[PDB]
């Protein structure tokens, strides 16, 4: 669903307590400095992201605070928040389980991993665990297509996943231990699963086939 109409709730209201930590303020001012003078609105997307990091989700009070700190009308902030997917306009769990289901990643049976998540957490797609730990939601391509069906958790990618490995990942997250980012089998990042079909000789050092003039 994800209704794009903010209805005032006792938890999500303009009076909801929100602010920015002083270190977060310094990050905001650096981000603003990273843009040409007179176009401070260009910092809206990262600044809002900061409001996410120190709040998990984005309350409407954070929306208005971003508008104030960026001297931008609140409607533009609301628009950029509702448009982009990563901004969580509604409270979310600690571990956002995002499972890719596009064709390149579904072809290798991503549905098995999705069903393994559903069975392990007892949570259907689009809900949050009752203990507010995991939130299983479905996403489009996340960029790791050459890898087997991967899963994104908050900030970490986990590729080459097979139901058993993601069972380990989930119950390890339940125990507080962070799983090691990367494919959960063999291959480090993207090399051929069999061996190495290229880059076998040491790369040539400074100066190799350099044009004479240069």
């Amino acid at each position: 669903g994800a209704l794009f109409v903010h209805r005032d709730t006792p938890e999500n209201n303009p009076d909801t307590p929100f602010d920015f930590t002083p270190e977060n303020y310094k990050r905001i001012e650096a981000i603003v400095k990273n843009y040409p003078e007179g176009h401070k609105a260009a910092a809206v997307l990262p600044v809002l992201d900061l409001a996410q990091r120190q709040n998990g989700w984005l309350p409407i009070s954070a929306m208005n605070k971003v508008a104030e700190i960026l001297q931008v009308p609140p409607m533009r902030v609301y628009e950029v928040a509702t448009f982009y997917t990563m901004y969580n306009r509604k409270p979310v769990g600690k571990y956002h389980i995002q499972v890719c289901t596009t064709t390149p990643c579904m072809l290798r049976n991503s549905d098995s991993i999705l069903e393994a998540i559903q069975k392990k957490l007892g949570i259907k797609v689009g809900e949050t665990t009752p203990d507010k730990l995991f939130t299983l939601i479905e996403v489009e391509c996340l960029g790791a297509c050459v890898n087997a069906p991967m899963v994104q958790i908050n900030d970490n990618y986990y590729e080459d996943l097979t139901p058993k490995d993601i069972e380990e990942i989930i119950d390890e997250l339940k125990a507080g231990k962070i799983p090691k980012p990367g494919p959960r089998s063999g291959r480090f990042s993207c090399e051929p699963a069999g061996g190495l079909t290229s880059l076998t000789e040491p790369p040539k050092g400074p100066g190799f086939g350099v044009q004479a003039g240069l």
Partner: protein
Amino acid sequence: PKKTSFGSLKDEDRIFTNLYGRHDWRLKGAQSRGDWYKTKEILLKGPDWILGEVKTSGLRGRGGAGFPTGLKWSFMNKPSDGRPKYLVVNADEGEPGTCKDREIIRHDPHKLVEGCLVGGRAMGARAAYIYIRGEFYNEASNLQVAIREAYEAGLIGKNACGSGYDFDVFVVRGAGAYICGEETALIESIEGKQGKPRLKPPFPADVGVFGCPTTVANVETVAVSPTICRRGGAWFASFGRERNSGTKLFNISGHVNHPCTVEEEMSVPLKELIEKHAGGVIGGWDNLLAVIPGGSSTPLIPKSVCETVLMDFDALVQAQTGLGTAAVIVMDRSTDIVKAIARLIEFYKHESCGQCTPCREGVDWMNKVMARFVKGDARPAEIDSLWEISKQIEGHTICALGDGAAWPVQGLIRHFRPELEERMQQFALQHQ
């Protein structure tokens, strides 16, 4: 004289030497691998020289289009007009099947930084805005670590490499949108507004980010640009067919035994690349049903054509498809092609920015039609209806996402109309 079987690229002549992170990705390892070497000479040679050697190299846009990189970059060789000039490196990487950009960012970021430097000098830009996607947080942090290393080393910043040039490389993070890969949509996303693409009566060379002239390139082309300057334009021109030169990062996935990413020369035989680098299709080449050459945008192609197809832009254009981003997606005989294409259309519907009518309304309609097709809830006439709808979408949208959503439907119809007909007949007989 002229190579016939363009393929089997050698290890010596490879732009990226650290695909799989086998060597130090910091400044020390990059310098060990020939990166950041003799950059001052390229900087002082002159922007016209860099642009001319890029044209000589014959580099075509490796981001999804096929525009000559030399011509597009020389579009900015105009004199100053008071407004600053900006180079922007697209790292959205939202097209399904694409995996190259992530690998180069997280394994060879210094090549990317040197690419921004040399490109900005060639086009006179004052700073670079590498727009990485929001998901690639680790990749963005690695890129920024390399940026900090280069800044400390003095290669970039004030007096870049001692050549008197002043360049900056900001990395703006995305927020989870595939349409942000579009250059004008990327420009507005950087500018703070939503990722809706802009119409192009004005061009980025005239009006871009913040209104100042901007030029959007791809991660791969800017990454190879310093290597193009160092090794030489003719050295790049040697590889690949005519007008289709250079080496490309092919991302092989789908139903391949060993999906991977390889830096192979252009106009390569598809069968040979699938067999050697990827390990062949699961169940052998006979078990191959279809191949998507360059990502969701490029229409799929059947095995009969896949038998002998070179992997250059023109060869796939003759094959009623496109090279796109060199995203090989193989589907075996155990694949529901209707289901896969419907999933692609669902992805496009979920990623449409909704600005213009043909993409906002048309793509959703195609999604519903394909959803009915997967269950065969239709009649033979709606196949032609879907073809007409796809044609109406084509050439009528602000950006190319409408065409990139219409092309898979056209390819699926053109190569598997009997499959849809038979599935529809099975549903009709079952519903009796």
